[PDB]
């Protein structure tokens, strides 16, 4: 919510991919609620058209800060591992792959 | 370096030292206000409040709760009367860009 609540302690590279170990301060630990969606807040998406202008991903301050944005939910069991979504659209759609599922 | 700001009243021999951040807050006359928002909008605890292009106040502190983000701000006694009690607060930190054929 625009306020720093944690810090990426370390990053590791394995065969599967990239694993980030992060820490959240005890002051804002309850605000996570255990059903959080993590979005890459280090990249910026720009779309321009005749009337539609979208500046998503991160703002200017969010870009100069970098890191991982957190979207809290309501209830969860505090699972060990969480996926890192590319953007808010994929985080909402719960789609890990870039292409959507064929229906 | 300590700074002395004289006042009036009964002489006293004990004082409580506040930092320069709280110097405006601890003034004898100051308009203290609280504003709630769903997001911080990239506003820290040092951003200055601007009225008609002239700085009149300062965001003393920012807090994050379950409801949202609460900013506690201070307004100098010189411009306290200009608020008039029916003020509308706008985020002066974000920028909106729209481009079209003529607009």
The HSE-up count of residue B50 (CA atoms within 13 Å, CB side) is 8
Q: Which residues of A touch B95 (CB under 8 A)?
A: 60
**Whether B40 and A3 lie within 8 Å, measured CB to CB:** yes
A52-79 exposure pattern, b = at least 16 Cβ within 10 A, e = fewer: eeebebbbeebeeeebbbbebeeeeeee
How many angstroms away from the CA of B54 is the closest CA of chain A? 23
Instruction: Name, in order, each residue with C-beta under 8 angstroms of B88's C-beta and a sequence gap of 6 or more.
Output: none
Q: Which residues of B touch A5 (CB under 8 A)?
A: 64
Method: cryo-EM
**Whether A1 and B39 lie within 8 Å, measured CB to CB:** yes
**Whether B97 and A5 lie within 8 Å, measured CB to CB:** no
**Whether B40 and A5 lie within 8 Å, measured CB to CB:** no
Beta bridge partners of B61: B72
Q: List the Cα angle A72/A96/A29 in 5-degree steps.
A: 20
Do β-strands B54-64 and A18-24 pair in parallel, antiparallel, or remain unpaired?
unpaired
Instruction: Name, in order, each residue with C-beta under 8 angstroms of A70's C-beta and a sequence gap of 6 or more.
Output: A5, A6, A32, A36, A37, A38
Q: Kindly provide the resolution of this structure in angstroms, with one decimal.
A: 3.5
CA dihedral for A20, A23, A44, B65, sign (positive or negative): positive
């Amino acid at each position: 919510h625009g306020v720093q609540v944690g810090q990426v302690i370390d990053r590791k590279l394995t065969s599967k991919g990239v694993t980030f170990t992060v820490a959240i301060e005890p002051q804002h630990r309850e605000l996570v609620k255990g059903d959080s969606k993590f979005v890459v807040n280090s990249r910026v998406d720009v779309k321009v058209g005749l009337d539609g202008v979208e500046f998503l991903g991160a703002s200017a301050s969010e870009w100069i800060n970098g890191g991982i944005r957190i979207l809290p939910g309501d209830k969860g069991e505090m699972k060990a591992s969480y996926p890192l979504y590319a953007n808010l659209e994929k985080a909402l759609e719960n789609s890990l792959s870039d292409l959507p599922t064929t229906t | 370096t300590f700074e002395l700001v004289p006042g009036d009243g009964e002489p006293r021999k004990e004082f409580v030292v506040v930092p320069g951040e709280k110097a405006l807050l601890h003034e004898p006359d100051v308009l203290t206000l609280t504003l709630t928002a769903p997001e911080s909008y990239g506003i820290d605890a040092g951003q200055p409040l601007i009225l008609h292009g002239v700085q009149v106040g300062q965001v003393i502190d920012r807090k994050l709760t379950s409801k949202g983000v609460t900013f506690t701000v201070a307004i100098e006694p010189q411009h306290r009367e200009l608020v008039k009690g029916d003020s509308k607060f706008v985020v002066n930190s974000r920028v909106d860009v729209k481009v079209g054929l003529d607009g």
